[PDB]
Amino acid sequence: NATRFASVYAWNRKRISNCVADYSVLYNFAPFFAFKCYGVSPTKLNDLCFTNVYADSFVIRGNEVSQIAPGQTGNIADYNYKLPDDFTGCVIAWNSNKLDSKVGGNYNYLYRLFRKSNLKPFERDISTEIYQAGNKPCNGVAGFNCYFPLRSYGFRPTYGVGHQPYRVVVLSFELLHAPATVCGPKKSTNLVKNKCVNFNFNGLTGTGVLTESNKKFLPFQQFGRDIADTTDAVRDPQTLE
């Protein structure tokens, strides 16, 4: 909920950290048209926590929301905002013509359609250098069939239908593998030891007995592990035990 969204050619990236991810107040604040998660179910996000979280943020024509799917290929996903096949996260999007579109047109949301090569996942190319889309070279701002970003898609309120500006945020988190910094709204209990319990540490549910270790995790380690890759030991996030 802020005045103007960033352009898709130069997508904004905020790091969410040191806070509680209560999503319920967002879902009851505003509707959305898209809500597609990958490597996670929306149902589970209450009992879960994330290592480092980034929101990728921009405004785009509603057709191109299809291009935000994991590793998909198309004009925005090849040259502007590629996300990988192994992206774990959620995509959320909603119509903005009630907020950003203008009856005289809006031209602030630049985008690109051509580049020298298909860019790498989560890389951004803000360079305004001219592109040789004609066979002969092009220099300065001019050139024979040459351009850099193309014209910003003109947004009018009544003009676009499935084709007006939609605001997009993509939450590109990692989970259950490191000291976590962004957790769901579920409250913690006290600890207990030497008794069988349904434990959950940073979202890592299981069933077992807990005991004090002799093991000496370095400050970067949250979980300790065995030959079957199951978690053998854990660092208690409320006290670092």
């Binding site: 593998h177 490191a178 000291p179 093991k215 995790f217 370095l218 970067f220 380690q221 949250q222 979980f223 300790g224 592990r225 030959i227 030991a233």
Partner: protein, 36 residues
């Protein structure tokens, strides 16, 4: 303003065993672990 300084005279040496690093944020002990 800038000034050209800091001339270099490279030589070659043999990095015997150096530059191993903990590949992930996980604890493991008493094990031989294979990683790419």
């Amino acid at each position: 303003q800038c000034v050209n300084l800091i001339t270099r005279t490279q030589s070659y040496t043999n990095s015997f065993t150096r530059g191993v690093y903990y590949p992930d944020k996980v604890f493991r002990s008493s094990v031989l672990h294979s990683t790419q």
